[PDB]
């Protein structure tokens, strides 16, 4: 069928299923070999010749087709994965000027839309999230003064919505990436994460919210938050989260932190409490 329709991706899904099973035939190939079904080979003919061609882009959904077909491969997935990555990253293409002084970002400004983002599979999704996390932590450890590409931060915001990935998503991010970015002492990536927290999510579970608020008080108090932008960001997020708490969830949430109330409230600012 035609490629422009997202439902046709569902149509190709069974084909990709077979590919994955053949990938499980990569090891122990001498046991239980299952031949190709009769009608699937015509469909299978298209994907391989698509793989051989070197003209692949988001105009059609063949990039997502390749990702779904070869996510479980270490050599066939690397070409589509990169092909998305430099497009949403702008690997040195240009230095676009952000508002204010000394703010330089990459030239990529177009992220993946919802239809394309929802045309992928869970494994390709987590691989992309892991790749994005690795490069952003790499930038944080390299002490880069260059602001990250706007397209990739929009993609970062759009990839945390999915509820099925909380094992790899918000929990892992808050537990690991935020303390490591804080310990890297960059405060640029830290500011981007803080502003993303502020205006780019709606559904966050209450214990994640209270943990994030405790993190803000920890980071807010020490680590010389005397710069105007940092305190404004921290001040803004301290009021945005507090004023958005649910009515019937605060009671079962704060009863967990009764022993040490100092971690959920500030000392310098009376406005917060």
């Amino acid at each position: 069928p035609d490629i422009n329709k997202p439902q046709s991706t569902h149509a190709f899904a069974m084909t990709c299923i077979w590919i994955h099973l053949n990938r499980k035939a990569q090891n122990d190939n001498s046991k239980l070999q299952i031949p190709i079904p009769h009608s699937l080979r015509l469909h299978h003919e298209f994907l391989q010749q698509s793989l051989r061609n070197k003209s692949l882009q988001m105009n059609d959904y063949k990039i997502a087709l390749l990702c779904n077909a070869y996510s479980t491969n270490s050599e066939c997935f690397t070409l589509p994965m990169g092909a998305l990555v430099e497009t949403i990253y702008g690997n040195g293409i240009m230095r676009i000027p952000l508002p204010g002084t000394n703010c330089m970002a990459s030239g990529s400004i177009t992220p993946l839309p919802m239809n394309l983002l929802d045309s992928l599979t869970v494994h390709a999704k987590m691989s992309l999230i892991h790749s994005i996390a690795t490069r952003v932590i790499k930038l944080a450890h390299a002490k880069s003064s260059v602001a990250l590409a706007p397209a990739l931060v929009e993609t970062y915001s759009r990839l945390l919505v999915y509820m099925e990935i909380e094992s790899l998503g918000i929990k892992g991010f808050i537990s690991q990436l935020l303390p490591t970015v804080f310990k890297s002492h960059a405060w640029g990536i830290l500011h981007t994460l803080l502003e993303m927290f502020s205006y780019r999510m709606h559904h966050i579970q209450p214990h994640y919210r209270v943990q994030l608020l405790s993190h803000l008080h920890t980071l807010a108090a020490v680590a010389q938050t005397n710069q105007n932008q940092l305190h404004l960001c921290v001040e803004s997020t301290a009021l945005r989260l507090i004023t958005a708490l649910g009515s019937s969830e605060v009671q079962p949430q704060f009863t967990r932190f009764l022993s040490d109330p100092k971690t959920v409230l500030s000392a310098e600012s009376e406005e917060l409490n």
């Binding site: 952000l98 508002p99 400004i109 759009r158 405060w187 640029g188 709606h202 009021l239 004023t243 406005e271």
Partner: protein, 513 residues
């Protein structure tokens, strides 16, 4: 620092003579906040509004906020441009960064005392590099302070017109509010005492919030057609009092949304990026907001909601009424106290009906008279079955805070009224099933209900010649003793037991141990 200055400013304005001095003071305040950018406006207004003054000082600070917001043309020429060149839906577009560039180059923002640096006569330049800003501006940083100052203005009586003009000039800021409906619900449910008498202010508030976001969202997302047609117009000393059809329509929309319909009374949305996880929650909140904002007092609204199902009303088909009971209970439990408090008076009225006290024509089981499932056949006798069903439904969907108000009502109002055995059976059927919840959450209520039941039994026994259903009563008391109360209600029981008729004493020996 800023709070002390805020206190000083209000004290100064409490001592500042009205006239040209006030105008120049508000102009120079505007100049400091923005022409030199010493402090962002939001922090200064939050510090001004976080004061605990008494008397005229509160009015002075409120009026200073009013003059700092609307008088200044410069503040206005930014929010209008922002709301004209941006939309709340961000996930559906890919050209936001350049629009941000255009808006920010139209009005540069200074956060490192830039404007204060340039105005210094010696050349002062800032060299500290900034940090990446992708979403920040003064309007979005000011929005929560705007909500909180709306709350502060509602806390005080003579500043209603300032609220009206503030809304009429800055209603556009709420196009980008993430959860406006819940904010309205909490604000209207929290300030009901201060808003029962000022219907015009409440109408203005709800109208401004709904009309702020009447373009992006599809038609008929929050308000019904009849309310948007009749009550939307300005009042003329004849507020639009509705008939029962309006309430029937609201309850029907909720049961159709919750039951599941392919077309649906509410247009579908992407729940991933909204504030309401489910269509049912969204429907409940908007229905509560629309019903609570009327100019009619709570008693009549609650009585009409109950009479939707009590009185013989078409448009409510049979064999589907349990869903209507469900919708009524869910709606009435979220409303404030004056609305749902009418159920006690309804129970008091039905317990005094002649069919329970004198007309005892039905000699058979009253047990099947109170079984509402008997509605399968045409045995809906009187309001007794319907009121019993609503009491069960309302108390099921209520929290322990609402249920804790029951024992005082039981021991104060119903105690001197029950004389015959049918009324005793009615109150047993009414109270029995919720002893589980009471024992789970509040044991004192359990003690009170047990002693009230024993006292009621003694009163009926003293004032009645004989009891034809003593065996079910004894079985129920034994079940209560061996399941819920244990052996905690002991001391107060022997005095009541010792004064009863000898047959009851013979059949209640084991209660005392």
């Amino acid at each position: 620092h800023v709070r002390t200055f805020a206190d000083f400013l209000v004290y100064e304005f409490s001592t500042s003579a009205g006239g040209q001095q006030l105008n120049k003071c508000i102009e120079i305040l505007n100049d400091m906040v923005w022409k030199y950018n010493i402090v962002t406006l939001d922090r200064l207004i939050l510090c001004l509004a976080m004061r605990s003054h008494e008397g005229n000082e509160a009015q002075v600070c409120y009026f200073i906020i009013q003059l700092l917001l609307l008088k200044p043309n410069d503040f206005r020429n930014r929010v209008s441009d922002f709301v004209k060149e941006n939309s709340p839906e961000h996930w559906l577009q890919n050209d936001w960064h350049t629009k941000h560039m255009n808006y920010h180059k139209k009005y540069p923002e200074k956060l490192y005392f830039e404007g204060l640096a340039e105005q210094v006569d010696p050349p002062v330049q800032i060299q500290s590099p900034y940090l990446p800003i992708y979403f920040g501006n003064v309007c979005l940083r000011f929005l929560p302070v705007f909500d909180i100052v709306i709350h502060r203005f509602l806390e005080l009586l003579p500043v209603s017109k300032s609220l009206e003009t503030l809304l009429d000039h800055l209603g556009g800021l709420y196009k980008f509010h993430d959860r406006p409906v819940t904010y309205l619900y909490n604000t209207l449910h929290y300030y009901e005492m201060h808003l029962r008498d000022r219907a015009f202010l409440k109408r203005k508030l709800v109208h401004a919030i709904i009309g702020s976001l009447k373009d992006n969202r599809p038609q008929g997302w929050c308000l019904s057609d009849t309310y948007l047609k009749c009550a939307m117009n300005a009042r003329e000393e004849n507020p639009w009092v509705p008939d029962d059809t309006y309430y029937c329509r609201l309850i029907g929309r909720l049961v159709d949304t919750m039951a599941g319909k392919s077309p649906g009374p509410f247009p579908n949305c992407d729940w991933r990026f909204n504030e309401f996880p489910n269509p049912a929650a969204h429907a409940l909140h908007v229905t509560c907001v629309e019903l609570m904002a009327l100019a009619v007092s709570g008693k009549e609204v609650g009585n009409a909601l109950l009479n939707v199902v009590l009185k013989s009303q078409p448009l409510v088909p049979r064999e589907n009424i349990t869903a209507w009971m469900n919708a009524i209970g869910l709606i009435i439990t979220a409303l404030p106290e004056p609305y749902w408090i009418v159920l006690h008076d309804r129970i008091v009225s039905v317990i005094s009906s002649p069919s329970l006290t004198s007309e005892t024509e039905w000699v058979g089981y009253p047990f099947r008279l109170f079984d509402f499932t008997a509605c399968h056949q045409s045995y809906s006798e009187m309001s007794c079955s319907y009121t019993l069903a609503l009491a069960h439904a309302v108390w099921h969907h209520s929290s322990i805070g609402q249920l804790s108000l029951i024992p005082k009502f039981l021991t104060e109002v119903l105690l001197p009224i029950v004389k015959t055995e049918f009324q005793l059976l009615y109150v047993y059927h009414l109270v029995g099933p919720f002893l589980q919840r009471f024992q789970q959450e509040r044991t004192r209520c359990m003690i009170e209900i047990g002693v009230a039941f024993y006292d009621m039994l003694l009163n009926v026994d003293q004032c009645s010649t004989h009891l034809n259903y003593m065996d079910p009563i004894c079985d129920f008391l034994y079940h209560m003793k061996y399941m819920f109360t244990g052996d905690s209600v002991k001391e107060q029981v022997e005095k009541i037991i010792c004064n009863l008729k000898p047959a009851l004493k013979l059949r209640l020996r084991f209660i005392t141990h």
